[PDB]
Amino acid sequence: VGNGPTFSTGGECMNTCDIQNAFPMNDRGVRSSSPFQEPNTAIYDSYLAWTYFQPMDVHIEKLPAPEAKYYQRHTKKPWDVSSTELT
Amino acid sequence: YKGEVPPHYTRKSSATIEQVEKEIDALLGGAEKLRKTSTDDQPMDKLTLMERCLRHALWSYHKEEGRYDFDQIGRWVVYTPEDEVKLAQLKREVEAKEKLAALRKR
Amino acid sequence: DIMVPSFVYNKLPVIHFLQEKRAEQKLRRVLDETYTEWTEELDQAHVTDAITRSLNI
Amino acid sequence: MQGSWSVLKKNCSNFFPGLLAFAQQTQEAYGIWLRIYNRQQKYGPTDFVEQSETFSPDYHKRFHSQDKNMWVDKELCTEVSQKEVARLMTYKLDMWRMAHCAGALLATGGYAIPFGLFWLANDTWVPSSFNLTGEELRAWREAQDLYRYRSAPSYLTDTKWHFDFHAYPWNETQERAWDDLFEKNDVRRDPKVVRPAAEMYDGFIKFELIRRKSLRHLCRSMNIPTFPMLARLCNGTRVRDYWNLAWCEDYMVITQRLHESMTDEELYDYAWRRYLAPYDKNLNREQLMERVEDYFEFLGPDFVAHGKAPNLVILTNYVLGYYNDPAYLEGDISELDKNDYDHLASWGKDAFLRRLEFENGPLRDQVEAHTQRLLAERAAIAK
Amino acid sequence: TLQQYRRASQDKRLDDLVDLLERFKPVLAREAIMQRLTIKHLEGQLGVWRYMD
């Protein structure tokens, strides 16, 4: 697996944060570090506790590609700048 | 008994029942791998909900039309004891009419 | 460059969670409004009785 | 909309004809307003005529009260027709923008000329009279719609966020109404479902308590100039006057069923002045009638019975919800097959990253078991 | 005769079914998009800008 970063956490533990319900909980009882479902989330205990997610090679049943009609919204405006372009 | 033939209604879109059924089958066929069965008392999934709604509407339309296929109607339309009783009453009536017609031809 | 981006990032998880629930709520309401509609049709026995009466029997 | 040279040429060519047309419209609109004002002063309620004072309960600041300082003249059809009211509303918008420009000119003398060049290069703040042909009018309406699109979402989000962060609905029906009020324009909102939100918000913020920032967003969405904003009771007065005229026309139309006999273009204009029908949507008569009927239904029976409209804040949110387009999404789904952090691949993994992968990887259970067993053995040895 | 009687209701039901299908398709599209986003997240190859887009 690669060395890339993941969804930022801010050094927070999601099992005790004020918005913990927004983070899914896995079988082991560790809330995810992101809105996504994570199977191998862990918690590390320094002076303060923090949640960590380790990327790994996992296969997920991929639903086939939908048509462009059902997910593309052509409401772009001259002032609009996408997050990729802003980055 | 019925009264007046209801007011006429103009369709907003044009499509055949066979085309609709084929489209439903195609829509539900791509998610078969993702679809997961579960206990009847457990919460349902999005695929299960979509399948139930689509099949319920389709088979209600079919039963209204006349395609009395009880095998699927008992699966995709029965959700109430009153519903089960109505199906049983309808199941008997159709068989009785068929037997009477055959006997009256013989 | 720094402050607003960080607070937008903080907002994403809760908004994503709430909008998922809202979508599930819409689907649930769609299912809840569905109810098998059984129709009632004139029993044929009355037709058979009117047929008999018309014969003057 | 951004400025362009073609629009600059258009407005420079039609500058003086536009001014002459504006003057003629000014005379006509003064006549119409004089009739309406005389009728209001003569037949209006005592509170409306005397301008009764309504103060906020926290800082005791006066603002217009929807119940007392707004009055629907049910018998205005005798003196003023529906078309005259529409003409007055359009002229009020044009006159507001012209007045701000004239004030800038008087304030800055001859130094406003380059700013005038910026002004004529955009159709956002020029009067409708500057367009002498259909295509020019269409472009002008497109600019107005673009400004509405730019401004409305901020107003809707301000209202929704402040309420949701500081309050919650009382009952399930109010919850459904509040949730369905702020749906995007790609879905049709049932006015009967959404109406209870008006009372729910009346409990929270009436029009008399509207904040200055929310007012600025609303006036931006209504194509009302906001600079100089000044006290909130100036643009608030503008909003009150505009919607009072709109409600008078709405009562006339509902009572006399004028919209059914109204032609296609006039119907589209009527919906547009209510912020219900953008021109870029290319709506047909069926859709326009559906939206207008939904607006009338949202007003409710009490509007005809007593001339009392629902809360103005919620009404503005409801109508401006038609300019809340779905968030844009462009690009084929295959773009999701790419990778974002390939530029980091050359860096590899350091010791800490390797440790994290080892402990939290597929072998995590074995490492946890070994570590816990070793720690238990060491603890036992220590004791 | 019965068919002629039960005709407007059938047409409305068919139109409603078509509308329901068109309503469900976007939901499945969003589900597929979320699946792909999750796949890239688990690999460590998903930026927040892409997710927001």
Ligand SMILES: CCCCCCCCCCCCCCCCCC(=O)OC[C@H](COP(=O)([O-])OCC(O)COP(=O)([O-])OC[C@@H](COC(=O)CCCCCCCCCCCCCCCCC)OC(=O)CCCCCCCCCCCCCCCCC)OC(=O)CCCCCCCCCCCCCCCCC
């Ligand atoms: C030469 C010296 C200059 C001094 C320096 C000036 C510096 C610039 C400041 C601004 C000056 C004004 C600019 C012109 C504005 C146009 C006229 C006007 O009032 O338009 C109506 C319009 C009314 O607005 P509204 O919100 O509807 O009013 C609510 C009322 O309830 C409305 O009442 P209603 O609902 O009952 O309806 C009535 C309506 C009904 O009428 C109609 O419907 C018909 C249309 C009537 C109005 C038409 C206006 C047309 C505007 C465009 C003109 C053409 C421009 C062409 C440009 C290109 C030229 C080539 O008729 C009205 O609009 C009447 C309003 C009241 C009259 C206001 C005028 C008072 C001043 C003039 C008298 C001065 C006498 C001096 C005596 C000296 C003694 C010693 O005015 C505006 O849009 C307001 C101006 C917007 C800019 C504000 C900028 C800040 C102002 C701060 C001023 C502070 C004091 C001054 C010192 C400043 C130091 C910092």
Ligand SMILES: CCCCCCCCCCCCCCCCCC(=O)OC[C@H](COP(=O)([O-])OCC(O)COP(=O)([O-])OC[C@@H](COC(=O)CCCCCCCCCCCCCCCCC)OC(=O)CCCCCCCCCCCCCCCCC)OC(=O)CCCCCCCCCCCCCCCCC
């Ligand atoms: C003939 C004509 C007919 C007759 C005349 C008729 C009357 C005409 C007048 C009335 C017209 C009204 C309508 C105007 C609309 C257009 C307004 C406008 O500007 O739109 C933006 C306009 C473009 O508009 P647009 O593209 O249509 O987009 C409009 C959208 O809707 C976007 O809209 P938005 O809403 O997003 O934009 C709004 C934006 C508008 O603002 C902007 O967009 C900013 C524009 C400037 C940006 C500059 C960027 C570039 C900087 C370059 C720096 C130098 C570079 C190096 C140069 C090297 C040269 C060798 O923000 C604001 O509104 C902020 C307002 C701030 C107000 C400030 C008030 C301060 C008060 C002070 C406190 C007082 C407290 C009380 C104290 C009391 C004490 C007693 O911007 C430009 O075109 C930029 C022009 C840049 C020019 C070049 C750079 C400056 C050159 C300076 C030369 C100096 C020479 C002398 C030097 C001497 C040295 C000794």
Ligand SMILES: CCCCCCCCCCCCCCCCCC(=O)OC[C@H](COP(=O)([O-])OCC(O)COP(=O)([O-])OC[C@@H](COC(=O)CCCCCCCCCCCCCCCCC)OC(=O)CCCCCCCCCCCCCCCCC)OC(=O)CCCCCCCCCCCCCCCCC
């Ligand atoms: C990275 C570095 C880059 C460079 C950075 C540069 C350095 C910046 C450092 C500091 C920056 C911050 C400073 C803040 C100061 C404090 C501000 C404050 O307290 O504001 C309170 C407050 C806040 O404003 P607001 O009304 O609540 O809303 C502001 C929003 O931005 C309204 O937004 P909105 O969305 O609601 O409305 C959008 C739209 C809505 O559209 C409309 O409303 C329609 C169009 C309206 C047109 C204007 C109508 C004006 C009517 C009359 C105004 C009253 C006149 C009073 C008497 C005249 C006094 C001179 O409005 C506009 O687009 C406005 C267009 C204005 C364009 C001009 C902007 C400034 C560009 C520079 C030009 C001047 C350069 C001079 C220096 C160089 C000389 C060589 O301001 C006021 O109450 C406004 C009073 C205005 C009085 C007139 C200006 C007084 C200042 C002296 C003017 C000197 C003129 C010199 C001429 C040339 C001589 C050679």
Ligand SMILES: CCCCCCCCCCCCCCCCCC(=O)OC[C@H](COP(=O)([O-])OCC(O)COP(=O)([O-])OC[C@@H](COC(=O)CCCCCCCCCCCCCCCCC)OC(=O)CCCCCCCCCCCCCCCCC)OC(=O)CCCCCCCCCCCCCCCCC
């Ligand atoms: C380049 C030019 C430079 C210009 C410089 C001058 C300053 C700027 C000029 C104007 C700028 C444009 C914008 C101004 C603010 C706009 C405010 C606004 O939106 O109002 C809307 C509002 C319209 O809304 P509305 O619904 O019709 O009525 C308001 C509601 O009632 C509202 O209902 P409410 O529930 O909110 O009711 C409350 C409301 C009730 O009030 C009102 O709304 C009524 C109108 C105001 C009445 C004020 C007079 C009160 C009685 C004064 C008695 C004095 C007796 C002294 C006797 C001395 C004997 C020796 O407010 C109050 O209660 C406030 C009362 C005022 C308290 C003043 C406290 C000052 C403390 C002093 C501390 C110490 C100072 C230093 C030491 C000094 C001594 C050594 O407008 C007004 O009501 C009138 C606006 C008047 C604007 C100012 C006109 C400026 C004329 C300038 C002439 C001189 C020029 C000099 C130039 C020099 C060379 C350059």
Ligand SMILES: CCCCCCCCCCCCCCCCCC(=O)OC[C@H](COP(=O)([O-])OCC(O)COP(=O)([O-])OC[C@@H](COC(=O)CCCCCCCCCCCCCCCCC)OC(=O)CCCCCCCCCCCCCCCCC)OC(=O)CCCCCCCCCCCCCCCCC
């Ligand atoms: C490049 C830089 C160059 C140099 C620059 C030099 C800068 C000098 C720094 C010092 C300036 C301090 C003042 C800053 C003002 C800005 C504050 C502000 O916008 O706060 C936002 C603030 C925050 O609002 P928010 O948080 O959104 O909502 C809160 C409330 O809900 C809001 O709800 P609301 O709106 O209903 O409630 C507010 C309203 C509620 O009340 C009403 O509605 C009733 C209105 C009553 C008006 C009473 C007027 C009385 C006048 C008596 C005159 C008698 C005649 C005498 C004639 C002979 C003598 C000349 O009351 C007022 O706000 C009006 C109070 C009285 C205004 C008096 C005129 C302005 C005086 C400015 C000079 C002060 C001394 C400066 C030196 C010392 C500095 C430490 O909003 C407001 O306050 C809105 C009104 C803003 C109007 C004031 C600005 C008008 C534009 C001035 C035009 C002249 C331009 C000259 C340019 C000079 C360049 C050199």
Ligand SMILES: CCCCCCCCCCCCO[C@@H]1O[C@H](CO)[C@@H](O[C@H]2O[C@H](CO)[C@@H](O)[C@H](O)[C@H]2O)[C@H](O)[C@H]1O
């Ligand atoms: C520089 C200043 C610029 C000002 C610009 C705006 C001017 C507006 C002028 C409007 C004039 C209206 O004219 C005025 O109307 C009112 C209201 O109908 C009339 O009012 C009359 O009927 C009313 C209503 O029954 C009575 O309460 C009142 O006692 C009586 O006078 C006045 O007799 C008339 O003079």
